[PDB]
């Protein structure tokens, strides 16, 4: 068959031999090999290299190896430093890097050959800000994880310049899990309305230790900002009467999407997690859905581009890829109905700032 | 023990440069000019330029330097992404990094700490601006970050303040690099202290349009957080009282500093005649202190054992054998150079160093004291500059202040006669300060009124129009 | 103000909801400690701790 060889650079998550991201990438390339509408005349084989965590130099060496193998895009990684390295190893050689998680963008960067797919956190923070204006708040308390900075919460921070807010910023203890003295100072300082900012494992941790601190009452109100709020387990907090709201980007109410959530978690392709942790079981998390959608929309851009072959690209030494610039215009131009919603990029800077959210909240059911 | 090679990675331009080539050539000149006994390890420093800030090209440059038998790398000056690539490459090859640049990347501890940093920490500069604002008795300040990375560089300042429009409101310059709308929001939002974060040219544009808005007189206190402050030139904005603070890192008592600035002054004119030489770039001084720190620590290493330098390759993973030992000998060293003291704590940051604080004065700068690494700030070391004719408003009511025959100069002298006129005459004749009279704006004594402010002469005082309202106000 | 634990279960969530909605703060429980632990777990899940 006609050959096309994507590539992935994934990170060593030791819950199994393959993390959720690489599981989603291999599962997704299997379903696009199988569906004979999306690319019936080609075959997506894929070269997947697995790097350690926080290794910019190992990532780049791996990516130059993939580019030597000859590749037609590069998916992942998800950490900011290694992602930045491989994004410029691509911007150089002219192959489309397709991010999946939110990297920290350097504003002076002139890289044109990248497409992010996590919804851009400026526009997502505008959504958080419209929730803050809708609940008519004054005394917000942003609580951010220090794995990233405030740079993605720049719109919440620039918010009290142009509104009437009082936004006290506090920082989670990054080295540990127990948020006990933070939550104690939060309760003592009467900081009721709290915007969290953390990955959903951290969100389950702070919710459990907010329950044991007794900060789960009628008063408190936790706007989460991870897109995995629905994959929390709200069974211990369902009755207390917290209004914890948050955003959801998966199309779980659509049938063709929920069938693939089921086909994901009906044989435990998703790795079996710790059920005593606090997040639920048998779900497709947002990162896995985003990687699924990533290789879907890149497959679409291959279908709009017939004659494109895959060229041997010698790293740290030579030309750009020939077909890559037309290919990259095609990926940025591409449009897809996927599990994340619709998918179309802001065609200037490659980010994704046009999408449908779903404001979910905790009611008694 | 052949010699001591090093690596310079630069982010300057050949013409009108900040001058890192001249700095490191001058430094190699100086430490080769030290005549030790015996004819010991003659220091060379290799220049490796780096055109655009891009991690791929940095990786190419680093891959060239590692086989050249480097003992420690330093630079790049003003490219943070290139600095992070250099840092992780040399941290996996155990070549010591000496970061002369700032930290705009989110620094993670899982990225290993094989990287000392001569440039003071973002957390330290944030603590310095927070202690300056404490010693202004916490005024309703306002940041003007040039780029989003300001929030990373001032993380501790932002999260140590209740972000609102009365304690700290953060405003960010837009893609246009024009500061007038956010300066206008600052003016009519009734805020005084303006913390400007940016490089020299963008802070220059903000302060120039701040003067061309009228916000430069002694009401407004500007805190510039560029540690490349004193190379600025605010001619036309340097006023009688302008409160333009700033930080600086030069022990100008240093015995090399005048010939340092003289050599860079000469080599600026020769390289380009674009403008005057604005003073030494902090990155140039930091590169001088950097190569001195490397030479002192490696001479301490070679004084205790024998060092060995082997040409490493980017492909394979030959770790340098003396990585942790040179890291300990680096993070123990103390230097006394063109950034004050160079002593490092455990993490590889900098401590026991003194930030001079400058104020933009008549021709250049004039200190408001120092801010130390640990302890608080002595705002009175040169002197504490809290110490930084009048207008006489009157109604015209007989017989208290009665108008004279209004043909001659009824202003100052002839403006009236009567008990009020001689009253203010004798009053400031005693209190010894000249003040010119002016008839009131409304003609009523005025009432505190329901349009927000007062009416008449009351509002004429209250809106700070004139100075002393010396007339029969009840 | 007397109320009564539903003895045929430990599903006292409607009683705890009535006590919460009626703003009955100070409560004298009267039960053996098995039932006391049960009602304490229920009142934690009810958010009355």
Author numbering:
A (entry chain B): 33 to 397
B (entry chain A): 21 to 408, 416 to 501
C (entry chain D): 200 to 248
Text of the article:
Kainate receptors (KARs) are L-glutamate-gated ion channels that regulate synaptic transmission and modulate neuronal circuits. Each subunit has a modular three-layer design with an amino terminal domain (ATD), ligand binding domain (LBD), and transmembrane domain (TMD) which forms part of a common pore. GluK4 and GluK5 cannot form functional channels on their own and are obliged to co-assemble with GluK1, GluK2, or GluK3. Here, we report structures of the GluK2/GluK5 heteromer (GluK2/K5), proposed to be the major KAR in the brain, in resting (apo), antagonist-bound (6-cyano-7-nitroquinoxaline-2,3-dione [CNQX]), and agonist-bound (L-Glu) desensitized states.
The intermediate resolution motivated us to use particle subtraction in Relion to independently resolve the ATD layer and the LBD-TMD assembly. After subtracting the LBD and TMD layers from the particle set, we refined the ATD layer to 3.6 Å resolution, and then did the opposite by subtracting the ATD layer and refined the LBD-TMD assembly to 4.2 Å. Inspection of the conformational differences and the measured RMSD values showed clearly that the LBDs had ‘open’ binding clefts that were similar to the antagonist-bound LBD reference structure. We next identified the GluK2em and GluK5em subunits in the assembly by exploiting successful visualization of the mutually exclusive N-linked glycosylation sites on GluK2 and GluK5 subunits. This shows that GluK2em subunits form an interface between the two halves of the ATD layer (B/D positions), while the GluK5em ATDs heterodimerize with GluK2em ATDs which position them at the periphery of the ATD layer (A/C positions). The antagonist-bound structure is expected to feature a closed ion channel; so to understand how GluK2/K5em restricts cation flow, we visualized the pore profile using HOLE. For this analysis we considered the correspondence between the pair of GluK2em and the pair of GluK5em subunits in the GluK2/K5em TMD and measured an RMSD of 1.5 Å.
